[PDB]
Scaffold this active site. Sequence first.
Site, mmCIF file in Angstrom:
data_model
loop_
_atom_site.group_PDB
_atom_site.id
_atom_site.type_symbol
_atom_site.label_atom_id
_atom_site.label_comp_id
_atom_site.label_asym_id
_atom_site.label_seq_id
_atom_site.Cartn_x
_atom_site.Cartn_y
_atom_site.Cartn_z
ATOM 1 N N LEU A 135 -2.942 4.051 3.231
ATOM 2 C CA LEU A 135 -1.999 4.766 4.083
ATOM 3 C C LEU A 135 -0.577 4.241 3.971
ATOM 4 C CD1 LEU A 135 -4.112 5.274 7.324
ATOM 5 C CD2 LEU A 135 -3.692 6.914 5.433
ATOM 6 N N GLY A 136 -0.372 3.046 3.422
ATOM 7 C CA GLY A 136 0.976 2.547 3.255
ATOM 8 C C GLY A 136 0.941 1.041 3.124
ATOM 9 N N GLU A 137 2.062 0.485 2.684
ATOM 10 C CA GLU A 137 2.309 -0.935 2.594
ATOM 11 C C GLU A 137 3.697 -1.180 3.182
ATOM 12 O OE1 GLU A 137 4.652 -2.133 0.039
ATOM 13 O OE2 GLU A 137 4.442 -4.202 0.781
ATOM 14 N N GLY A 138 3.834 -2.307 3.868
ATOM 15 C CA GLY A 138 5.085 -2.816 4.389
ATOM 16 C C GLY A 138 5.030 -4.331 4.226
ATOM 17 N N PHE B 145 4.532 -7.124 5.807
ATOM 18 C CA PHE B 145 3.505 -8.017 6.329
ATOM 19 C C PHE B 145 2.097 -7.486 6.080
ATOM 20 C CE2 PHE B 145 7.321 -8.050 8.990
ATOM 21 C CZ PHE B 145 7.687 -9.385 8.875
ATOM 22 N N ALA B 146 1.930 -6.207 5.724
ATOM 23 C CA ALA B 146 0.615 -5.590 5.773
ATOM 24 C C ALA B 146 0.493 -4.412 4.830
ATOM 25 C CB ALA B 146 0.308 -5.144 7.205
ATOM 26 N N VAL C 38 -1.973 -0.882 4.978
ATOM 27 C CA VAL C 38 -2.741 -0.094 5.920
ATOM 28 C C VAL C 38 -3.660 0.845 5.138
ATOM 29 C CG1 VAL C 38 -2.623 1.468 7.976
ATOM 30 C CG2 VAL C 38 -0.826 -0.186 7.583
ATOM 31 N N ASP D 170 12.106 -1.707 18.286
ATOM 32 C CA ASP D 170 11.965 -1.190 16.939
ATOM 33 C C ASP D 170 11.591 0.286 17.062
ATOM 34 O OD1 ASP D 170 10.155 -1.662 13.825
ATOM 35 O OD2 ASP D 170 12.338 -1.712 14.127
#
Lengths: 65, 297, 281
Positions: free
Chosen positions: B9-12, B14-15, B17, B123
């Site tokens: 579902l995604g990457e950022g 720290f993580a 998903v 945020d």
Amino acid sequence: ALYEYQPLQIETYGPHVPELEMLGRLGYLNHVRAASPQDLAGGYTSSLACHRALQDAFSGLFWQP
Amino acid sequence: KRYEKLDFLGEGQFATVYKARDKNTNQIVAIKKIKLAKDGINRTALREIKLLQELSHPNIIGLLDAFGHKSNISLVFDFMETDLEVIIKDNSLVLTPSHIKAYMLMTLQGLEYLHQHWILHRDLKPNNLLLDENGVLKLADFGLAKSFGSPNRAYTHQVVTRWYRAPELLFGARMYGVGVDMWAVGCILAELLLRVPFLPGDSDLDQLTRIFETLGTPTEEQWPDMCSLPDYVTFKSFPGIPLHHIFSAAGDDLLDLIQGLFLFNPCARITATQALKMKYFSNRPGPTPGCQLPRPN
Amino acid sequence: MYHNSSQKRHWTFSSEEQLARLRADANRKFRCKAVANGPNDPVFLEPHEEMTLCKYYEKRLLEFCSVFKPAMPRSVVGTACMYFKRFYLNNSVMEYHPRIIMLTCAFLACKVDEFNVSSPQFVGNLRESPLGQEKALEQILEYELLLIQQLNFHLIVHNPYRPFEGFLIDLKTRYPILENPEILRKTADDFLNRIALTDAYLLYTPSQIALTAILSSASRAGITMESYLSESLMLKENRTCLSQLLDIMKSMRNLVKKYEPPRSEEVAVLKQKLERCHSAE
Ligand SMILES: CC(C)c1cnn2c(NCc3ccccc3)cc(NC[C@H]3CCNC[C@@H]3O)nc12
């Protein structure tokens, strides 16, 4: 099917906390440190710290497990 | 470990998903698996864990479970199909006034609850307003969220994405309250109305220029003590553009909401509670049901 | 907020004998496991001996947090000590050594309460050789997820300290019969430090704990405060709540009186048995 605001009823199991705008006119703010001009300019008012302290004091005072 | 990984579902920072099936119930969940030296478990993960364990509201993301191995923890959430950024950017969707009312209402309800529990989201932006398949908006990404109302703690000022960052944070406030989320709701409301980032500054000084150019340079009568802020620099006197020339389709009720959200004085700027009590929500048209909110497909 | 916290919901127990069962069960499971791993062998600690080592290591946690540079805020020390208590509620002191869990509790508390100490600043507070500080850091990080799993991911701790400030504000504004309630502060802090050594933090709300500390300072001063409870806190209208509250404060004071410290010669023997159990783990 319009909105009507409902006050967000959550049970604090302890005494009534006086509302945030009442704190000065009820004399609570005499008994906390005043917000500095920097803090005021940012939106911290010491009504915040007062109200949070009063909310914690009364939070579960009447609750037993 | 009860979780069969479906999709990514995604990457950022720290993580990563993933969509997963909970085998114990056949619920679709989003597992946020935290990435990584000698600092232990990542504070952004612990911030999200600690705060979301203490919050339970329809319009805040439920942390359903958490687990891990040696300093690699993973957090299980309600699966959300979309975010408000995808709705805003999807030029095929019409954001009617009732859709904007519904999105605003759910945001302010989540934020009222959050602020009542003495937490700043810190945020808030259209990415972080996730929508489930039933059209319930939830606040998500608690990675910068912090407990407020304690003087004994200083807070950082580099802590909302620039375009949604309140002028007190750009002027370097280290003590602040709900005004840093309520401004960002203003910026999100503005972006719901305009379909484009309202104040898209390239830098923090450009963000201040964009704000003051749009809404007027604040006087010390509008915002007392403004000059006390650490990173206060005086600006040219911009008149500002009247909000009905910005929000050409906004009714006077909506303009009162927008104006209350965009007050320069963070003390005078409306809370989520007093935003929800405004005639904008009480008026016609009603906010749309979640089942009738526009679905970017 | 405490009234909907994980603390209230999961970590505030009905009685001191419920806590005893949890700890007895944890002791039993370590023995049952160790015997299944290859049965009434004197190498094991009894639950009351684990309790004495938990009391001893609570005190060392207090001293670690006391001398800690930069100065560790009172809510971090309270969060650490609550984690130490909560860990050794469902866990044996024979399985996980309390000297490491003490430090893991402090380290996790620093992170959870946003007291942004770096790992080198953290283990720099251990009065150890730098190789032992780095070894201790490895063990701290190794046990950190274990702590979080054993806390059931319930990391926010509500301490009595903020409710105590709230009552000290409320006394000044609403209860002028007590002129200068700040005379109560030192002796109420003393009681708050005493009640933290007991199981009170697992049995009572932090508001009840804070109120007990204030009223016990007042009774120690010869000041009656029943009118604060009845008139100011409105318990004149709900006598059945005044009774419950006075019972809680009474049981909490009795729970301090029945506290016996970990005796130095008792501990000196129990530590050797703890070490022997860790050597032969
Ligand atoms: C971790 C949890 C809060 C979560 C639940 N559903 N979901 C989806 N779903 C797919 C998706 C795709 C496009 C737009 C929004 C959602 C994506 C996603 N991505 C990670 C970040 C990205 C920035 N926005 C906040 C998200 O949590 N996080 C989540």
